[PDB]
Design a binder for this molecule. Structure first.
Ligand SMILES: [Mg+2]
Ligand SMILES: [Mg+2]
Ligand SMILES: [Mg+2]
Ligand SMILES: [Mg+2]
Ligand SMILES: [Mg+2]
Ligand SMILES: [Mg+2]
Ligand SMILES: [Mg+2]
Ligand SMILES: [Mg+2]
Ligand SMILES: [Mg+2]
Ligand SMILES: [Mg+2]
Ligand SMILES: [Mg+2]
Ligand SMILES: [Mg+2]
Ligand SMILES: [Mg+2]
Ligand SMILES: [Mg+2]
Ligand SMILES: [Mg+2]
Ligand SMILES: [Mg+2]
Ligand SMILES: [Mg+2]
Ligand SMILES: [Mg+2]
Ligand SMILES: [Mg+2]
Ligand SMILES: [Mg+2]
Ligand SMILES: [Mg+2]
Ligand SMILES: [Mg+2]
Ligand SMILES: [Mg+2]
Ligand SMILES: [Mg+2]
Ligand SMILES: [Mg+2]
Ligand SMILES: [Mg+2]
Ligand SMILES: [Mg+2]
Ligand SMILES: [Mg+2]
Ligand SMILES: [Mg+2]
Ligand SMILES: [Mg+2]
Lengths: 209, 64, 120, 114, 123, 56
RNA sequence: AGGACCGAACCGACUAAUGUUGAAAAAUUAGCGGAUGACUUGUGGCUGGGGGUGAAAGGCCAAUCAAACCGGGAGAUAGCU
RNA sequence: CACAGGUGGUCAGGUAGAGAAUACCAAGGCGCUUGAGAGAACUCGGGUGAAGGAACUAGGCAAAAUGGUGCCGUAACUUC
RNA sequence: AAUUCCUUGUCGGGUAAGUUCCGACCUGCACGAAUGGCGUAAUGAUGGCCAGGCUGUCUCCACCCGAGACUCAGUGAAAUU
RNA sequence: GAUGUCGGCUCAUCACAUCCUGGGGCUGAAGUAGGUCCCAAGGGUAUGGCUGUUCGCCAUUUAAAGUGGUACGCGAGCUGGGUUUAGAACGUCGUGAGACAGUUCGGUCCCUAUCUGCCGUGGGCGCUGGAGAACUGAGGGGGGCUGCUCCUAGUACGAGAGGACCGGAGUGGACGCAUCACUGGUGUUCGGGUUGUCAUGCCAAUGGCACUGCCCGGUAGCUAAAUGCGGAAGAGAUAAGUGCUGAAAGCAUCUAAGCACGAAACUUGCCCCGAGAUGAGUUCUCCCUGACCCUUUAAGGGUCCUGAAGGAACGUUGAAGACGACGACGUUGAUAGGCCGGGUGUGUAAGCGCAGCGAUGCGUUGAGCUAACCGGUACUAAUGAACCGUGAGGCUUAACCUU
């Protein structure tokens, strides 16, 4: 089933009558406007091109403006694609609300993660640090060894090294959606999603179930 | 018999550190264990610690 | 990691930095315009302008408060009695950043920090 | 953030008494017992006040049977039924974590009657 | 949050005073134990006349934690130190009868029902 | 932490391809007088946006 | 009274950590030992290499010591490289 | 080497303090001849860390803690 | 035992568990009486072991402040090849 | 004209001759529990005590505590306990210097990475008029573990003691991803306390230094011990194995003919990177629609003219960031700093009057102050502008507007 794109308002908790705190994520799931419906006949496969937010009429670039004009709707802050299930038909000049996500009980949220910068071997890959004391000479937070010796000769591809962590679109999956708000364009889901306040989020339904 | 080899405890540079010369023999149903790390060769020790193992087995059988 | 960690450190230790700010602000108050490094100038904005705002409110407690960050007995007076009527009908915006060039000895981006009401 | 604030405001408790730190307060808590919900009284000293809007919390300190009990209650929860203050505390302090080691006569603080 | 080598005060009247945890029981590589969890302990301080003797190994259940135990509503219940009740190795039930101090809502199940009945205060 | 062979002049040249500076695209012009200056930095005289602000 | 004690100057040098194309051909930093004595230090003086001196480590004898440095034998010799 | 080292003697200002310790200051000198940024890992010198409390490790190495003056008090052993 | 190879000797204490330690046994490979034997208060930057305390040593690392490392301008190495 | 040795650490990785998980055969497999044998390497595979040890032994665990390879991996990654120097001592042997796979105490571990590799990350250029986008997915990687308890049932067995099945639920532990709402941690740009001190003419009130002077707190943010999630559910072709029907060989046969199942292996399904996948894919959208010459008449050289899309570069910046890069704004603007209204932390600021000898307290007053919070508001600056970028797009065939 098709997803819907939102934006992080932040975190909050639901106090229930029974007495269970539910750490709900508040996502500004706005009027997701259709720009293009991809198909099998000419394009190749089934997908939907969606847009969310608002961009200035003066700031928006000419080809992008043209594209928007062709579609027949106002410009947002980016474009996102969602793979269609066999049995869903949508128009070009259309806007999708949070009404579609009223039926589902679980969702899978993709988001641009908090950019950890140049993470060290310990912070990136959850390494044990070497001894802080006990003779250790300038090695406390370092990888230690990387390879073996003369036999492998090289160091293996995809090895756990210090480098860029975060700043990457990643999914947290099977998250329990608690409340659906169509009046003020909100989505309320149990748990925590990637990104900061104002991070443009990608909310897919339960592909796991 | 259960025959197991390991490193000799102590001094000898690169040589003793890199030998499995020391041997321990354990009798499986009994639980009596005889070790030796005397001679340089594994093979002398194996037969000396077996000779010792045999001796100890006799004692066990003599004592029972 | 400096996620939303505002306040440019400017190499110096914290107390030293504070002292510099105190001095810098005083200088600004005195001379109406001071030639300085751009980041330094920027940093100065978020201590001197607040002090100016404080001065705008004329009272003994305010004066006492000023006698800390700004420190000087004459500078404070200038802020209160002369710079008070200077800025009366303007919310914030007491400072003006105008870049000039580079500090030739080390090639440092130089900017003139000044009080907005400079001309008169 | 504004939307979040709005959400909080209607969910927040409208019947919270203005309670000081150091106060001798009795907290009626809705404890579960088998299936039926039961009220339990926990009378102690206010040693911390956290104020976050909806996520506001308060720490209660009393010594039970010998061992001291620190219990943080979420202020905007339906579980906490009654905030019943008896006698106020006369301190010039908010978060009184020195009571964690203070026992006996040293545990008793001056009474605020202002 | 009890672990290995951790000293604890005795909650019951079995005949012990200070008890040191030697194993966090119930799973591989297990390190942290909250309330209502079984940990293998040794007795290091004993009351002269008691059922349990110094240097005895036995399993025991966690009753109070200084770290603090959580409710579903997010409320935490801290305690002044860390305390435990001493259990039998085979039957998996308490040795002592008189228990001093408060217990927890997380403690109460089939095995520790008796313990909760015994205890004067439950939190 | 030392070279094992001598690297070429070629290699060095290749390395230096990025190390070469970026030239300033164009000068900025004062509208009133016609003074050529750096971008967002003031003129030699003290003019800025067709207005003299600094005497020095 | 103290080859007393704690402890600065002073004298050392136990431990770490740094530094190891060093700030430095042995140092810094934090600690550590002695600190009225078999103390420590300045100024001058003597002892000379199979010799000196040595609370003795073959230690020290000008960043060199199981026999200093320099010049000479001397282009030693080198079945070795 | 304009080298964090090595070099003997004379002078001893204020308050605190047993003190030439240490602490701010007076006299008097200096800011240590590259800076300017930014604010990754990592290294260095540190600060603080929930719960534990040596489980670390070869070894409590390091670190932490202890620490002052008066008063009370003080064991085995002892060459008293 | 600073000596015991066999040996982590055997027994006891200490520990949940102790090749270390302390006590003892004695079968001293190969102690031993001024190349002293055996005791011994005090002393030790002495060796080993244990207990309390104390703690980021560690579980398990987290953050923060500084000097670098990173960018710019300035000057400008080296080992090595 | 140098191959650092054991061990520990930190990272591992491959190998199956699999320790467990998992599938299966046999059993002297009633059942649990097993034993063994065949498959099978996706993942997991202990903390301590003693010892320098690996080993081992023990304590406890655990679903299990695999055996190995990898210079018995890994010292230009750490340690240096063992060992392999120089001191010393013991036993011992030696007349002696000294020596011992005898013991014992003490004893410098250097290297700023050129290339390959790797981790990330850019720039140039390419993909053929030029852009701005949206994406497929060639491929690659990550992740792939499980226990315990309850329900079915004290029932399928079983003299009995006892206690058995597939399947589902709960629910943990270790690991990974995400995050801050909670609990905290931190917080030297916030408040308050206090010791010493010096300075502000002096009282007050402040400030400076003292590791932030030492503390008690604590905002944003990062962050775990926190709390959400995740191991997928499953789905294909399978391994040993299990078969089905069925010949050579009138029996008979998992097979030569067809057809089913069978693990965590493998192809997909989940997440991510990813058309430099040069085989460079597709789709949407925009933009530039000019005249003349020259020698060799041509993918030739140009000349003027034009500058579009767009881009930088700058400036402001960002929960992006080592540096590019990436993302948001450039007056139509909340882009940044400060401001105004609100919110958080701290605990009645100072002045004033009162009481007390005075310290001090009282009232004044939950009082003033408050980073990075939130919302508003152009107060200042980010202005006019220029620069690169260009000019309706090549050759050969063919399906058609007009077959
Ligand atoms: Mg470790
Ligand atoms: Mg070292
Ligand atoms: Mg070193
Ligand atoms: Mg270090
Ligand atoms: Mg190596
Ligand atoms: Mg090779
Ligand atoms: Mg600097
Ligand atoms: Mg003396
Ligand atoms: Mg020193
Ligand atoms: Mg002494
Ligand atoms: Mg000679
Ligand atoms: Mg010659
Ligand atoms: Mg100099
Ligand atoms: Mg001094
Ligand atoms: Mg603590
Ligand atoms: Mg260990
Ligand atoms: Mg240990
Ligand atoms: Mg120490
Ligand atoms: Mg024993
Ligand atoms: Mg003995
Ligand atoms: Mg002798
Ligand atoms: Mg004699
Ligand atoms: Mg004799
Ligand atoms: Mg021990
Ligand atoms: Mg701690
Ligand atoms: Mg196989
Ligand atoms: Mg090796
Ligand atoms: Mg090694
Ligand atoms: Mg050694
Ligand atoms: Mg090294």
């Amino acid at each position: 089933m098709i997803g819907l794109v939102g934006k992080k308002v932040g975190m909050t908790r639901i106090f229930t009558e029974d007495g269970v705190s539910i750490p709900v994520t508040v996502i500004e799931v706005e009027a997701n406007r259709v720009t293009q419906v991809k198909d099998l006949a000419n394009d190749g496969y089934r997908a939907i091109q969606v847009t969310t937010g608002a961009k200035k009429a003066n700031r928006v670039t000419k080809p992008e403006a043209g594209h928007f004009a062709k579609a027949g709707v106002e410009a947002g802050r980016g474009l996102w694609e969602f793979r269609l299930a066999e049995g869903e038909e949508f128009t070009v000049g259309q806007s999708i609300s949070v009404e579609l996500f009223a039926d589902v009980k679980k969702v899978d949220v993709t988001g641009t993660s908090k950019g950890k910068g140049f993470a060290g071997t310990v912070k990136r890959w959850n390494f044990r640090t070497q001894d802080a004391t006990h003779g250790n000479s300038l090695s406390h937070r370092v990888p230690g060894s990387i390879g073996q010796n003369q036999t492998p000769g090289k160091v293996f591809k995809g090895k756990k090294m210090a480098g860029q962590m975060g700043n990457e679109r990643v999914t947290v999956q099977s998250l329990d959606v608690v409340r659906v708000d169509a009046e003020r364009n909100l989505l309320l889901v149990k748990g925590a999603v990637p990104g900061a306040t104002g991070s443009d989020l990608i909310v897919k339904p339960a592909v796991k179930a | 018999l259960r025959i197991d080899v390991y490193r000799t405890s102590g001094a000898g540079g690169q040589h003793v550190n890199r030998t499995e010369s020391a041997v321990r023999i354990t009798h499986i149903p009994t639980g009596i264990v005889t070790q030796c790390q005397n001679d340089r060769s594994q093979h002398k020790n194996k037969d000396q610690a077996m000779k010792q193992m045999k001796a100890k087995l006799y004692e066990l059988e003599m004592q029972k | 990691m400096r996620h939303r960690k505002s306040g440019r450190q400017l190499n110096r230790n914290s107390s030293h930095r504070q002292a510099m700010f105190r001095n810098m602000a005083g200088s600004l108050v005195r001379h109406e315009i001071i030639k300085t490094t751009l980041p330094k100038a920027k940093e100065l904005r978020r201590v001197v302008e607040p002090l100016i705002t404080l001065a705008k409110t004329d009272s003994v407690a305010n004066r006492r408060l000023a006698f800390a960050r700004t420190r000087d007995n004459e500078i404070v007076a200038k802020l209160f009695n002369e710079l008070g009527p200077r800025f009366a009908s303007r919310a914030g915006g007491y400072t003006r950043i105008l870049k000039c060039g580079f500090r030739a000895g080390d090639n440092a981006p130089m900017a003139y920090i000044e009080l907005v009401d400079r001309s008169e | 953030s504004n939307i979040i604030k709005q959400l909080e405001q209607e969910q927040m408790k409208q019947d919270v008494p203005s309670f000081r730190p150091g106060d001798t307060v009795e907290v009626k808590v809705w404890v579960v017992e088998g299936s039926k919900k039961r009220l339990q009284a926990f009378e102690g000293v206010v040693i911390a006040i956290r104020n976050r809007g909806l996520h506001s919390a308060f720490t209660v300190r009393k010594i039970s049977n010998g061992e001291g009990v620190e219990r943080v209650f979420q202020t905007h929860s339906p579980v906490v039924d009654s905030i019943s203050v008896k006698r106020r505390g006369a301190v010039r302090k908010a978060k009184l974590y020195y009571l964690r080691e203070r026992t006996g006569k040293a545990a008793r603080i001056k009474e605020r009657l202002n | 949050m009890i672990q290995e080598q951790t000293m604890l005060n005795v909650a019951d009247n079995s005949g012990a005073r200070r008890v040191m945890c030697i194993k966090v029981l119930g799973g591989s590589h297990r390190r942290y134990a909250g309330v209502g969890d079984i940990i293998k302990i040794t007795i290091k301080e004993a009351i002269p006349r008691g059922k349990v003797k110094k240097g005895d190994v036995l399993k025991a259940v966690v009753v109070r934690t200084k770290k603090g135990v959580r409710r579903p509503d997010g409320s935490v219940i801290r305690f002044d130190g860390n305390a435990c009740v001493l259990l039998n190795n085979n039957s998996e039930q308490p040795i002592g009868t008189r228990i001093f101090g408060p217990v927890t809502r997380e403690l109460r199940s089939e095995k520790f029902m008796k313990i909760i009945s015994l205890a004067p205060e439950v939190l | 932490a030392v070279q094992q062979n001598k690297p070429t002049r070629s290699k060095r040249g290749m390395r230096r391809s990025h190390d070469a500076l970026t030239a300033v695209t164009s000068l900025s012009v004062d509208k009133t007088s016609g003074e050529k200056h750096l971008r967002h930095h003031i003129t030699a005289d003290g003019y800025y946006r067709g207005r003299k602000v600094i005497a020095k």
